[PDB]
Structure formats: C-alpha cells, structure tokens
Amino acid sequence: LFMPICATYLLIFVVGAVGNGLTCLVILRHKAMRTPTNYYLFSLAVSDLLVLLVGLPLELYEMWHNYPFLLGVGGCYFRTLLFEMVCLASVLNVTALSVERYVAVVHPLQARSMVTRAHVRRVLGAVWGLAMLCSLPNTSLHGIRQLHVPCRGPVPDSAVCMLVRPRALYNMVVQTTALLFFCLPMAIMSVLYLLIGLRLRRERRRQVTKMLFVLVVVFGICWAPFHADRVMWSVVDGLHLAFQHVHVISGIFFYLGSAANPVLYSLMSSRFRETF
C-alpha cells in the first residue's frame, strides 16, 4: 500500500526541491541572472516548489492517516486555497512564458516591452491574481465533515476534508477549471510553439524547436492526470478501485512535472549552464 508510494513521492520531492531551489538561487545570487526574463522563471520555480511543499508532504500524511485532518478547518480552507492557487499559477506561468516566447516571432518588441520590469510585474501579477481568483470558487466547497450517529458506529471518531456542497456543483467547477486551465492553455501553447518552430524554420535552432514541443508534451503528461483525478471523482460505487490506482499514478506524474519544470525551463538553458 504505502511504502512504494512514499518512496516515489520522496524521490520526486528531493529532485524537484533541488531543481527549484537551484533555479531560484541562481536567479538571485548572480548579477547577470536577474534580468526581467528571469522573473517568469522565478515565479514558475516558486509555483512548482509550493506545489511540492503544500501537496507532497501532506499527501503522504493522508497516505497513512486519512482520519483525522490534522490542520483543522481554517487549515482545511487555507490548504485547499493555497494548493489550488499554486497549481493554477504554475499553469498560467507556463502559458505566460509561451506567450512571451512568441516574441521570437515578433522579434524587437521583446526588447521594446519586456526589458522594463514594469511589464514583468504586470504579467506576473495577472498570473497570480488570476490563480487566486479562480482558485477561490473551487476551494469554497471544501469543509471538514463528520456526521456519524452511533448506532453500531465504527472506531475512528474523526473527520476529513471533503466536498461539503453537492457533487454536481463540484463537477461543474472541476470541468470548467479543467477546460480553462488545461485545454485552453494547451491550445495556446501548441499554436504558439508551432508558430515559433515555423518562424525558426525560415532559414537562408533545431534544439529549440524540439524542446518547445517537449515542453508541451510534458505539460500534457503532467497535468492530464491531475484533472483526470478530479473529473473521475466528480463523475462517479464499487468502481473506486480504479480511482485508487488513478490517484496514485496521477500523483506520480503531476509531481514529476512539478519537479521537471525547472530542468526544462531554466537549468538546461545556456545562461544557467554558464553560471553554475
């Protein structure tokens, strides 16, 4: 049951923490690494690091102690809000980076517009404000619950964080967030990276054209299981063994993405390799 999941999760945690810490530390420590283009990378690193820290440790706790929620009702709301906000923030960081990297198609407006930190602050504020605002509607539905009447009730006598409102409203929220924060970002990324590859194809670098779609594929592999979990739970009763497998595998993939984002976006770049 537990130990293999714990082992995989902690390996993902150590790897992703090393990567995100390294990218933030490189961005801060070295004078040449605080260019406004790097602030998108710092925001992404922070978002993925908080996804790891807020989800991965407490998830393992739940892998061993479902009954009772440790953090209390205020902690229940705070954890749901922070976790959902950081997930949406990571998605919107990737999408904003894809839009900003589309400047490779309109070449000089990057220099004309990004070089000012005002633009990077504006777009990062948009990212995180949208993340919080669209996190709020889903998080409002979760509140510690326990209702048993002792007819021949079981031992546990504890409570857990779960959907207080009706499952149909949760399904509406889950599917709307899945559309607007996986399908729409996926379409934006695919189109803009096709265009980037196309304008880099007009000649007379190849690794860039490959890496862009590596990014798109990683985004798909890593976030599809997450919304897969949420939708599967919202739509379902005897089947829940399939959900039992789905949740664990989706966790593995999602946190692998949360750990891999640094490697893909910042660490393997020419700039970072030259400053390690």
Partner: peptide, 8 residues
C-alpha cells in the same frame, strides 16, 4: 478499500 480524495 479506502477512498482517496481529489487534490483540490
């Protein structure tokens, strides 16, 4: 057989 809960 115990139910995990979605990553809200």
């Amino acid at each position: 057989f115990f139910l995990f809960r979605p990553r809200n």
